[PDB]
């Protein structure tokens, strides 16, 4: 199976016209303008994960070209796609905002969905017990991070401009931040 | 006939 | 097996008369109007009045035995409008909706070769 950036999948077979490779079947991705950018194939389960430049990916079954699922990560090109050894977990990611997800297409569940700061992180604050750390960036969005897991539980985008400082109360129940939008 |  | 009537519709600006008769005309078979079928006078000319008016004669038409009617639509005429209003056409629709066999459609609005002076006066009317 060979795939092109234009969005065409060709199935090649060694057959008599004495025997040579020929394109027996042709499949096409009818994306309006999105281009095939990254692709991976799992021979054991016959899954094709194609990430398009529009920021959306398709899970296909070959050679029948059945659309298992269509789902979009955003408006940014999906940089990389990978398949698990068993073939049940699919990893996607893109560079512009820094995406990394792990998708369980079997149960339609999300093993991982984690994000990096677009800007440099300006300030950091530990929870009083140290279980979590809160980070702030020039974007103006706050993220809460779990030390043990290292994964982001929540993100806050209320601040319009860059957040300059972040601090916890002694109790740790409350969190306080001051931003370059003119608000605390 | 058809049956035959 | 097909006995014919004449379904006469008079579509005035304020009311619609649906009158079904014999071919010659003196014998009235059924006559109903929008005033029969509406609670307020402002809606007598409304098409809704015409339909429920037209349906009433059609049931009464099937009672006597008449199964077809010749339609002679008309307006108030004289020195007023020459064309039947929306009530007249709506009544014609309902007669088709009732199922009566429509024979022929003609406009018999009284057109004067010469008309007396209109009610409006010089400055006009219908403000």
């Amino acid at each position: 199976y060979t795939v092109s950036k234009d969005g065409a999948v060709f199935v090649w077979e060694f057959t008599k016209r004495k025997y040579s490779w020929r394109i027996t079947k042709k499949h096409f991705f009818y994306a309006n303008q999105a281009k095939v950018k990254c692709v991976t194939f799992h021979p054991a389960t016959r899954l094709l994960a194609v990430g398009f430049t529009s920021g959306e990916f398709r899970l296909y079954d070959l050679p029948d070209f059945t659309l298992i699922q269509q789902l979009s990560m955003g408006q940014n090109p999906v940089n990389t796609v990978s398949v698990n050894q068993t073939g049940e977990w699919l990893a996607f990611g893109s560079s512009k905002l820094g995406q990394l997800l792990v998708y369980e297409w079997q149960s339609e569940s999300y093993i991982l969905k984690q994000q990096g700061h677009f800007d440099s992180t300006n300030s950091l604050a530990y929870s009083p017990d140290g279980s979590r750390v809160v980070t702030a960036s020039e974007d103006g969005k706050i993220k809460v991070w779990d030390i043990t897991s290292g994964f982001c539980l929540a993100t806050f985008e209320e601040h319009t401009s860059s957040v300059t400082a972040v601090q916890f109360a002694k109790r740790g129940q409350v969190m306080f931040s001051s931003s370059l939008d003119g608000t605390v | 006939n058809p049956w035959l | 097996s097909q006995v014919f009537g004449v379904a006469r519709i008079y579509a005035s600006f304020n009311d619609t008369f649906v009158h079904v008769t014999d071919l010659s005309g003196k014998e009235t078979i059924a006559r109903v109007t929008g005033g029969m079928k509406v609670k307020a006078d402002r809606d007598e000319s409304s098409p809704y009045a015409a339909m429920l008016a037209a349906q009433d004669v059609a049931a009464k038409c099937k009672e006597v035995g008449i199964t077809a009617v010749h339609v002679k639509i008309r307006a108030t005429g004289g020195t007023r409008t020459k064309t039947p209003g929306p009530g007249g056409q709506a009544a014609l629709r309902a007669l088709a909706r009732s199922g009566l066999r429509i024979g022929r459609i003609e406009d018999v609005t009284p057109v004067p070769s010469d008309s007396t002076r209109k009610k409006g006066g010089r400055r006009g009317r219908r403000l």
Partner: protein
């Protein structure tokens, strides 16, 4: 144009059927099982009340049906239907043989009254809005003779 059968004891509408044309003549046999519907199109629809299905569909009359009459006895195969239209035409339909057994035009106006009786030979009493009563004698064979024409001097609504 919807025939609906209602059961008093059950208190519910058991059967609902559509007739071809509006019908203003309804008849029920003495045995309380068969119903004849007379439409303005001249069609006759005979319905079984308990079972709610059409048994006969006679289309012979030209004018509107004005009179319908059922005749026969329990445990008998002489079941008959007499139908009279608005043109003074009377037809004796045979339910068993499903055919027009006799046809009469002796009346001029609409026939509104019909009645059959056994002669120990069946006697039909046809009466219409022309102020006359006609007595006919007939059988299952091709015999149908007019015995008497009685001027009753009134618009015979029912006889």
């Amino acid at each position: 144009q919807l025939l609906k059968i209602f059961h008093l004891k059950t208190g519910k509408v058991v059967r609902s059927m559509k007739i071809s044309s509006p019908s203003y003549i309804l008849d029920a046999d003495s045995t309380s099982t068969l119903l004849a519907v007379g439409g303005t199109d001249g069609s006759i629809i005979v319905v079984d009340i308990e079972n709610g299905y059409i048994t006969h569909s006679f289309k012979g009359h030209g004018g509107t049906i004005s009179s319908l009459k059922f005749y026969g006895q329990l445990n008998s195969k002489i079941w008959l239907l007499a139908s009279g239209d608005t043109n003074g035409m009377v037809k004796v339909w045979d339910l068993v043989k499903r055919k027009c057994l006799h046809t009469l035009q002796e009346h001029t106006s609409a026939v509104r009254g019909l009645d059959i009786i056994e002669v120990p030979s069946l006697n039909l009493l046809s009466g219409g809005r022309d102020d006359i009563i006609n007595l006919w004698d007939f059988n299952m064979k091709k015999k149908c003779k007019l015995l008497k024409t009685l001027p009753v001097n009134q618009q015979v609504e029912s006889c």
